[PDB]
Amino acid sequence: RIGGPPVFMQFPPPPPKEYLADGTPKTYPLHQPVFDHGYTWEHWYMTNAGVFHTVYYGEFAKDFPWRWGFVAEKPFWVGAPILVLGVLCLGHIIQTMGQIGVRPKRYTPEWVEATKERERAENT
Amino acid sequence: GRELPEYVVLPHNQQRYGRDKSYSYFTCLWHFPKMVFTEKWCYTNIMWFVFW
Amino acid sequence: WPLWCGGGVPDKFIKIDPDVHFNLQGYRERIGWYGFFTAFLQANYHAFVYFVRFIPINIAIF
Amino acid sequence: FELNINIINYNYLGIIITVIISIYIYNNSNIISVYNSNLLLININIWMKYNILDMLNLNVLDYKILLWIVVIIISNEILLFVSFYWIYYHNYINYYHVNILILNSYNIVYNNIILLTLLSTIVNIKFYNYILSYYKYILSYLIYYNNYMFNNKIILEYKNNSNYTNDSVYMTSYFYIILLHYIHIYDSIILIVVYNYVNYKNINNYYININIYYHLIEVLYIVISILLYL
Amino acid sequence: YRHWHRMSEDDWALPLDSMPEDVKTLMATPQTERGFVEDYWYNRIRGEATLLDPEALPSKSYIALARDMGLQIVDEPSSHMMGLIELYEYLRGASFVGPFGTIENPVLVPAVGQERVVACTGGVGDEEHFTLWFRCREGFMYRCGECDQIFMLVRLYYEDRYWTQTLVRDTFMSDGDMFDLKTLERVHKMWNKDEMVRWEVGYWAQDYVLGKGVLPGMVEEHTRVN
Amino acid sequence: AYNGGYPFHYVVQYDDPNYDCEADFEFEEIPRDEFGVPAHIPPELSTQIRHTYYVPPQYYPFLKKLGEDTPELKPYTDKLIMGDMTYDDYEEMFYKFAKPLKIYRSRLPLPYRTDEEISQEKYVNWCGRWYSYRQRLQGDYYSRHYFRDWLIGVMLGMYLGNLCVQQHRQYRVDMKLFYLEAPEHKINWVKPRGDL
Amino acid sequence: TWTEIWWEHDPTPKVAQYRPYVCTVESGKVYWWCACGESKTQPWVDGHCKCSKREGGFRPRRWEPEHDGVRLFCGCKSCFSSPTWNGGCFTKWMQSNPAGGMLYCFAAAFGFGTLTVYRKF
Amino acid sequence: KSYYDDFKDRLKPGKYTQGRCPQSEGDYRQESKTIGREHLNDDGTRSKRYTVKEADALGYHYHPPIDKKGQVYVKGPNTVIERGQTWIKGYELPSMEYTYGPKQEDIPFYPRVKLNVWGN
Amino acid sequence: NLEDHFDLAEYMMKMHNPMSEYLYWIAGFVSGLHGILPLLHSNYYFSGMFLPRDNDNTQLCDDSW
Amino acid sequence: IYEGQTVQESELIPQEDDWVIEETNFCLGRNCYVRFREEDDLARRALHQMDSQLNKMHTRLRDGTVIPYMSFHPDEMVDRPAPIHTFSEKPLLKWTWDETYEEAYDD
Numbered sequence A: 001r002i003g004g005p006p007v008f009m010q011f012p013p014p015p016p017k018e019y020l021a022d023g024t025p026k027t028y029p030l031h032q033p034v035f036d037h038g039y040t041w042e043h044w045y046m047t048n049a050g051v052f053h054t055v056y057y058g059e060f061a062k063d064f065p066w067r068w069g070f071v072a073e074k075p076f077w078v079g080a081p082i083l084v085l086g087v088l089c090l091g092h093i094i095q096t097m098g099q100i101g102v103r104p105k106r107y108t109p110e111w112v113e114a115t116k117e118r119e120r121a122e123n124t
Numbered sequence B: 001g002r003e004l005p006e007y008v009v010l011p012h013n014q015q016r017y018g019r020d021k022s023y024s025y026f027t028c029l030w031h032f033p034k035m036v037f038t039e040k041w042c043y044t045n046i047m048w049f050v051f052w
Numbered sequence C: 001w002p003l004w005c006g007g008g009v010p011d012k013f014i015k016i017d018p019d020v021h022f023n024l025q026g027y028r029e030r031i032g033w034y035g036f037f038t039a040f041l042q043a044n045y046h047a048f049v050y051f052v053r054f055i056p057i058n059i060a061i062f
Numbered sequence D: 001f002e003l004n005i006n007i008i009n010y011n012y013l014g015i016i017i018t019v020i021i022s023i024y025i026y027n028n029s030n031i032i033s034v035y036n037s038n039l040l041l042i043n044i045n046i047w048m049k050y051n052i053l054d055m056l057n058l059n060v061l062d063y064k065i066l067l068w069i070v071v072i073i074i075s076n077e078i079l080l081f082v083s084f085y086w087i088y089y090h091n092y093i094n095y096y097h098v099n100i101l102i103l104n105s106y107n108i109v110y111n112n113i114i115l116l117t118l119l120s121t122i123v124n125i126k127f128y129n130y131i132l133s134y135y136k137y138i139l140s141y142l143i144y145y146n147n148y149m150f151n152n153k154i155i156l157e158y159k160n161n162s163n164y165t166n167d168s169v170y171m172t173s174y175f176y177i178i179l180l181h182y183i184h185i186y187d188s189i190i191l192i193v194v195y196n197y198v199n200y201k202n203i204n205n206y207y208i209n210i211n212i213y214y215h216l217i218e219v220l221y222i223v224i225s226i227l228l229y230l
Numbered sequence E: 001y002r003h004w005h006r007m008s009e010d011d012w013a014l015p016l017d018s019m020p021e022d023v024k025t026l027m028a029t030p031q032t033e034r035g036f037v038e039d040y041w042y043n044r045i046r047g048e049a050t051l052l053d054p055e056a057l058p059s060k061s062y063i064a065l066a067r068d069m070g071l072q073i074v075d076e077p078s079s080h081m082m083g084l085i086e087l088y089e090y091l092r093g094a095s096f097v098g099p100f101g102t103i104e105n106p107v108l109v110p111a112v113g114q115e116r117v118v119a120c121t122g123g124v125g126d127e128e129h130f131t132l133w134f135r136c137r138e139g140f141m142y143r144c145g146e147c148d149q150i151f152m153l154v155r156l157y158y159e160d161r162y163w164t165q166t167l168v169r170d171t172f173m174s175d176g177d178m179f180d181l182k183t184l185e186r187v188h189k190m191w192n193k194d195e196m197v198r199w200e201v202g203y204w205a206q207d208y209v210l211g212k213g214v215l216p217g218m219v220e221e222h223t224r225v226n
Numbered sequence F: 001a002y003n004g005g006y007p008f009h010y011v012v013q014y015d016d017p018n019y020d021c022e023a024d025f026e027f028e029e030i031p032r033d034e035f036g037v038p039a040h041i042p043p044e045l046s047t048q049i050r051h052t053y054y055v056p057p058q059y060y061p062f063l064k065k066l067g068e069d070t071p072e073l074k075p076y077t078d079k080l081i082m083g084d085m086t087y088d089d090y091e092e093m094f095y096k097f098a099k100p101l102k103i104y105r106s107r108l109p110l111p112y113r114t115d116e117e118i119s120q121e122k123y124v125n126w127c128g129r130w131y132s133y134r135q136r137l138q139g140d141y142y143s144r145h146y147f148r149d150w151l152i153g154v155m156l157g158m159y160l161g162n163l164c165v166q167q168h169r170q171y172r173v174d175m176k177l178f179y180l181e182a183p184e185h186k187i188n189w190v191k192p193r194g195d196l
Numbered sequence G: 001t002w003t004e005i006w007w008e009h010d011p012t013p014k015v016a017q018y019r020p021y022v023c024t025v026e027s028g029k030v031y032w033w034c035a036c037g038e039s040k041t042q043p044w045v046d047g048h049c050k051c052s053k054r055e056g057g058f059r060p061r062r063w064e065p066e067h068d069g070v071r072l073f074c075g076c077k078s079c080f081s082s083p084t085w086n087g088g089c090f091t092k093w094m095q096s097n098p099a100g101g102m103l104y105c106f107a108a109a110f111g112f113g114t115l116t117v118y119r120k121f
Numbered sequence H: 001k002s003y004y005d006d007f008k009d010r011l012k013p014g015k016y017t018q019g020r021c022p023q024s025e026g027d028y029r030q031e032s033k034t035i036g037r038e039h040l041n042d043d044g045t046r047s048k049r050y051t052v053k054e055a056d057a058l059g060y061h062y063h064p065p066i067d068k069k070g071q072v073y074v075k076g077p078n079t080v081i082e083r084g085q086t087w088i089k090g091y092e093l094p095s096m097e098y099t100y101g102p103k104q105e106d107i108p109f110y111p112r113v114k115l116n117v118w119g120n
Numbered sequence I: 001n002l003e004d005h006f007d008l009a010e011y012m013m014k015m016h017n018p019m020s021e022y023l024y025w026i027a028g029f030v031s032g033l034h035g036i037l038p039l040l041h042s043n044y045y046f047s048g049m050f051l052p053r054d055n056d057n058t059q060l061c062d063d064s065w
Numbered sequence J: 001i002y003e004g005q006t007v008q009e010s011e012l013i014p015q016e017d018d019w020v021i022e023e024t025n026f027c028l029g030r031n032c033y034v035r036f037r038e039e040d041d042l043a044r045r046a047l048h049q050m051d052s053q054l055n056k057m058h059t060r061l062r063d064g065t066v067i068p069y070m071s072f073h074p075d076e077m078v079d080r081p082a083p084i085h086t087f088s089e090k091p092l093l094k095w096t097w098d099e100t101y102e103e104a105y106d107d
């Protein structure tokens, strides 16, 4: 249809580049920080790149914060079992905070014996 | 039809923007409140919303 | 209609030039507050036509 | 060449309509609800305006898309009535031996069936004229007279009935099923009030929609008549 | 095509009110400088002037006759361009089925831009495989990694423009001898006399040449209320 | 055979030159069709009437020339000269001489490939065939291997399932001995507590 | 048995060992694994075997660890997860010595049956 | 080798948190005054005027792109005539080192193989 | 325009203002508070305490604390 | 079921005794997060992203033909991240049949 929305249009040229007074090129905000830490590992993974191709994808330590650079440096089966135990221990500790020193009477020895008497009478 | 140059030299010489500085896990705890109480466009919008 | 049953309008009789109809930059200063009110009322001609054709039977039921 | 579809980038009626819906919940007066309903009617009309303006795209699939949408809507209306029939027949074992007066099978059923059949014949004549690219002014006013009688009869029946919604589940189901049909009759008034002759004729989705909808209402009443009156 | 809507009234003819009022300049404008409406009336005025002159038709060659009616003589270049246009238009709302592509005869993938997404479904019967989508970019002979079918991109491009019916006409059609307004007047008097107007486009066209509203009844014809 | 026989577009004629179907609200004028048939003659009658196109006789020499230059076109031109061409005859003439556009592959620019590469076409086809040969054989090989391996899971599941069968088997034996021999089973033992 | 009876157009390795080779590897270092079984610095290419000389379709197999540690490397040269070991060395041995395979599988199955039955019973 | 060291130079550590100085030092909210950048803010983001307040989809700054002849600018292919034939040279994407950074060397080998299919 | 090619171009090109992310996280945080704040309010309304002491509705030993 | 293309014995005969399957690497290379330049503004970063598309990459064979990036579904055919308007020109799904008509050929 003549005059309809074109099926293809060429991009117009980008706006003029900006230079500072001294001639330095102007920089713009960029959310790709260079985290500061001592880790320099580089992990590479063969990745599917369609059906007939792959790509060797690399992860660099300097692109991650300190916490991940520290964890990702260690062998997985060294850190993993420690984390599993640590997380479980923390969960138990957190929930134990709210019941420090709570001593219900129904868990005392006297009450425990009485339940045994009831079970014997009722043949539970 | 408009004619533009390939580049333009700005009058000032300040490099205001660039790569973001390295940050920690809790960097947001102080940066976010700083923006609210220190950026003009932030608290002006808040006051405008609250007032009306 | 500009659909299959009709077609375009000859230039001799075109009264809404899109160059002036569109290009709405600064339109509120060109019509003022009262003109802004009139534009809002006239935008609802479609709704107004429906109400004129819809109220009378409701009055009968009422 | 051109793109197959002229994309719609932005829309603001959705926000307005959704806010109008919320106003129903947050009302402190039933008067606001009445005026809120007018706003909903206005904004829905604007949405219908956009559909008519889309004709300028000259897209062959637009008619088909809207037609199948109506088919889905019709199915939902049928299934809604099915649920009421389901509710009615679940307590069937508790009917006909309670000390209430059920409706007569002679007066109401016959005149309503006759009255609604005339409504179908009027709409059929409208379809025939639409096929022939022709119009008859009187037809619309026959529908209004038909709808006037239906409203007058139903109002009197409810007012003179001696049993109430709280008397038994039978009475509740009778009143509710009859009201649900009335609401669908009133929705037909909303649609038919704008019937006109448009010169683009058989590419106008409104005509086929009205014919399908009016037929649905009438057939539903036959099921209601068999269940309740006969 | 199946994906087009109903023919409009304009698809058959245009209303006389769309005729340019400066006919004298219209008949002198080069084809490359005529717009859609101007080109339509140039061909209709000049085409009907020759067709409504029976005594001259038998002595007029097909080349001249085609030129007067505004019809383009077909040649291999123009035919090639038009053919690929229609194939592109047809594929907008039709399936893409054809012979298996090989190096000698690659599958032709028409496109306006530099890229178009294509899928390979292999051969016929058992040779058909699951769809394998790829981006067909200009300047590469693409080979399916599964069935080894060869694809190639054909671009409808010409001198910073993409092929269109008007573009083909302008590139290849050559303007002939300038239209003579005497022919318009001569044919006008032939079919329009004493209040009988059997050649109405010429009647309007002649009136515009004489200014506007000169011939009988034309002032009343041009006066409108809204 | 479309739209019930009503054409989307058709010509209507009026006898009064100043007639307007939208302005006037009179009730005497009768519109005519393209052939001039008045509207009160129904189409089932008018369509039977034979209408032929009459061109002014000054066009006969031209129509003769068209027939001679294109003999296949002569029979249609003769009908037109003799006033025997109906609308259907015109349509047959129109579509008979319509031809499709031609695309020439020899005019398509080709993707760039060096002479050395063009000489390796047979080699690449040869490699492709061997890949398919290897692919098809491997499918049979893998299908046999893995589906056979699934039997190991069946046998492993049967064994582990049988462990619970044995536990259930022993459980039923134990239950049969509870009410008969087990001292845990007691009678005349539980006494009502009574309301608190 | 793909190379042995199904397909005759893939290179067929020689078994260096029917047991994996244990080696310490370091992250960020690339290792080259012998795919012919004739290198003298197993499990790595020595520069004189078929893999090093690119002879008869044999090429070195590139490998790189994600983390430092001790890893098992295929000695049979047919493990599915080659260069790393996954048990294919034992499987390929059973093909060569099926009588021995029966003894090991019976013994392994016998132990598994006793422990599982003893605990559940 | 460490591939990060190859493109360390390109990655200069940042100065401000989140890449912006305080608005007092530089007002990134205002539209840029640079010629040809009226649709952008100072920090390079699109201005609210361009995208919201005067969006072209709402009828502002009406400018039909298509010309009288129904044409729009189209960039042609890189054509070459050799050996009695007109050839088109396709555009190859730049080296992945330029776009991603890692030096394209010592790439692991992944051969061509057709689809893994179950047979029999 | 090149800037309009990608949806959410500023975010995808890594130039967006961080405040957008903060609002998203704040919105999520506020959503979470709708489960905790009414819990505290309802507890105080019917008991006079924001939160119970563990097992305070049961009999406790003399030294329990 | 699909089991690959059918092959005839004659199609496997080489024209030379030294022919072996070509060892062309189909690993497109080493990649990571797309790394933009601080100097590039919004428009030029968009160009940078458009030049890093894996689905625009291919492997050139020894005869000059290229095997492109291919996917089972068209979701992997749009630019990453997805642009606002993706399929300006309708993607073509190529079917094959043995039917032919004389007009296409010339003697």
Ligand SMILES: CCCCCCCCCCCCCCCCCC(=O)OC[C@H](COP(=O)([O-])OCC(O)COP(=O)([O-])OC[C@@H](COC(=O)CCCCCCCCCCCCCCCCC)OC(=O)CCCCCCCCCCCCCCCCC)OC(=O)CCCCCCCCCCCCCCCCC
Residues within 6 Å of the ligand: D136, D137, D138, D139
């Ligand atoms: C000596 C005179 C004798 C007269 C005897 C009485 C006859 C009365 C006939 C009334 C028929 C009304 C039918 C209503 C349905 C709609 C009709 C329709 O489509 O009209 C289209 C017609 C034209 O529409 P259009 O769109 O321009 O053209 C469409 C077509 O293309 C073209 O349309 P069309 O031309 O094909 O239309 C054909 C026809 C289609 O309809 C019919 O043919 C239906 C015929 C049904 C007959 C009903 C008779 C009812 C009589 C009952 C009496 C009971 C007495 C009980 C006594 C009890 C004792 C104890 O429609 C009409 O002709 C409708 C009537 C037109 C009159 C309009 C002027 C105002 C009313 C004048 C009434 C005069 C009465 C005089 C009485 C004198 C007696 C001596 O519409 C109009 O003219 C406009 C609206 C008004 C029409 C309705 C008028 C109602 C008048 C009722 C009178 C009788 C009252 C009895 C009361 C008894 C109480 C106890």
Ligand SMILES: CCCCCCCCCCCCCCCCCC(=O)OC[C@H](COP(=O)([O-])OCC(O)COP(=O)([O-])OC[C@@H](COC(=O)CCCCCCCCCCCCCCCCC)OC(=O)CCCCCCCCCCCCCCCCC)OC(=O)CCCCCCCCCCCCCCCCC
Residues within 6 Å of the ligand: F149, F152, F155, F156, F159, F160, F161, F163, F164, G080, G086, G087, G088, G089, G091, G092, G105, G108, G109, G112, G116
């Ligand atoms: C000699 C050894 C012992 C033999 C015993 C024989 C028993 C009869 C079976 C028939 C005879 C088999 C003879 C085979 C001869 C070899 C033939 C051959 O072709 O060889 C070469 C052939 C291939 O050679 P190749 O190609 O060179 O590659 C060799 C490679 O090594 C690659 O090898 P692959 O890829 O074949 O690797 C196999 C691997 C592959 O497996 C996988 O990839 C699995 C991946 C998913 C893992 C999912 C983990 C579980 C998730 C749980 C979800 C909840 C999470 C909760 C978390 C909580 C928080 C932490 O399979 C497994 O890991 C076994 C999984 C079995 C099911 C697991 C679930 C058991 C549930 C039982 C009921 C529970 C009720 C509980 C009641 C209450 C408590 C008591 O290799 C084999 O055929 C190897 C077969 C060996 C299979 C042994 C599996 C033993 C598992 C025992 C489970 C015991 C459960 C105890 C509890 C029961 C309670 C009721």
Ligand SMILES: CCCCCCCCCCCCCCCCCC(=O)OC[C@H](COP(=O)([O-])OCC(O)COP(=O)([O-])OC[C@@H](COC(=O)CCCCCCCCCCCCCCCCC)OC(=O)CCCCCCCCCCCCCCCCC)OC(=O)CCCCCCCCCCCCCCCCC
Residues within 6 Å of the ligand: B036, B041, B042, B043, B045, B046, I008, I010, I011, I016, I017, I019, I020, I021, I022, I023, I024, I025, I026, I027, I028, I029, I030
């Ligand atoms: C399930 C969890 C785990 C999930 C794990 C798995 C996740 C997998 C990944 C999933 C990814 C999905 C796909 C993602 C695609 C993202 C695309 C994108 O980024 O689009 C761009 C889009 C916008 O970017 P842009 O294009 O630059 O937009 C420019 C603006 O349009 C224009 O710029 P502008 O500056 O002009 O903007 C205007 C601005 C103007 O801005 C200002 O003026 C700001 C002023 C500062 C205000 C700050 C808040 C102050 C709060 C004070 C509170 C005081 C409390 C006092 C309490 C006292 C108690 C005693 O705002 C406004 O004017 C309106 C704001 C309205 C919205 C915010 C509402 C906040 C909450 C309000 C609550 C009200 C409660 C009342 C209740 C009363 C009941 C009676 O990005 C966003 O919107 C942010 C998205 C961030 C997330 C991205 C995805 C990352 C991956 C996931 C991370 C994990 C998230 C976990 C959930 C959160 C946990 C908390």
Ligand SMILES: CCCCCCCC/C=C/CCCCCCCC(=O)OC[C@H](COP(=O)(O)OCCN)OC(=O)CCCCCCC/C=C/CCCCCCCC
Residues within 6 Å of the ligand: D037, D040, D041, D044, D045, D048, D051, D052, D053, D054, D055, D062, D063, D066, D069, D070, D190, D191, D194, D203, D204, D205, D206, D207, D209
């Ligand atoms: C509470 C129960 C429900 C009632 C409450 C309100 C619900 C509102 C929901 C409305 C849903 C509407 C869906 C419409 C889908 C079909 C649209 C359609 O086909 O319209 C086009 C079609 C034909 O147009 P063409 O230009 O010829 O062709 C179109 C392009 N080819 O046009 C029409 O259908 C015309 C419609 C005209 C009448 C419109 C009336 C609107 C009524 C809205 C009712 C709102 C009432 C709210 C009450 C609230 C308090 C209870």
Ligand SMILES: CCCCCCCC/C=C/CCCCCCCC(=O)OC[C@H](COP(=O)(O)OCCN)OC(=O)CCCCCCC/C=C/CCCCCCCC
Residues within 6 Å of the ligand: D082, D085, D086, D087, D089, D090, D091, D092, D093, D094
């Ligand atoms: C020839 C034309 C008519 C054809 C009719 C076809 C009917 C098809 C019915 C489909 C649903 C069948 C559901 C199974 C039958 C169960 C009947 C039954 O048990 O009824 C009693 C039971 C209640 O008993 P209790 O819960 O135990 O205790 C009640 C104490 N107050 O009722 C029910 O649960 C049944 C309710 C469902 C039936 C009614 C609603 C569903 C039917 C809708 C029909 C719609 C129109 C026809 C559609 C088909 C057109 C081709």
Ligand SMILES: CCCCCCCC/C=C/CCCCCCCC(=O)OC[C@H](COP(=O)(O)OCCN)OC(=O)CCCCCCC/C=C/CCCCCCCC
Residues within 6 Å of the ligand: B025, B027, B028, B029, B032, I018, I021, I022, I023, I025, I026, I029
């Ligand atoms: C009596 C004993 C009391 C003990 C109390 C113990 C409290 C323990 C709390 C443990 C849970 C801590 C949760 C921490 C959540 C951190 C969330 C977070 O990271 O937010 C990220 C998010 C986005 O940041 P970036 O992604 O970095 O964006 C920049 C561009 N990328 O950051 C933000 O939005 C910052 C602001 C988020 C809101 C946080 C504050 C909410 C208000 C908390 C009020 C607490 C009141 C406590 C009163 C106590 C009275 C006794």
Ligand SMILES: [Zn+2]
Residues within 6 Å of the ligand: E120, E121, E122, E129, E132, E144, E145, E146, E147, E148, E149
């Ligand atoms: Zn294929």
Ligand SMILES: [Zn+2]
Residues within 6 Å of the ligand: G033, G034, G035, G036, G037, G038, G039, G045, G049, G050, G051, G052, G058
């Ligand atoms: Zn080796």
Ligand SMILES: [Zn+2]
Residues within 6 Å of the ligand: G073, G074, G075, G076, G077, G078, G079, G085, G086, G087, G088, G089
């Ligand atoms: Zn091994």
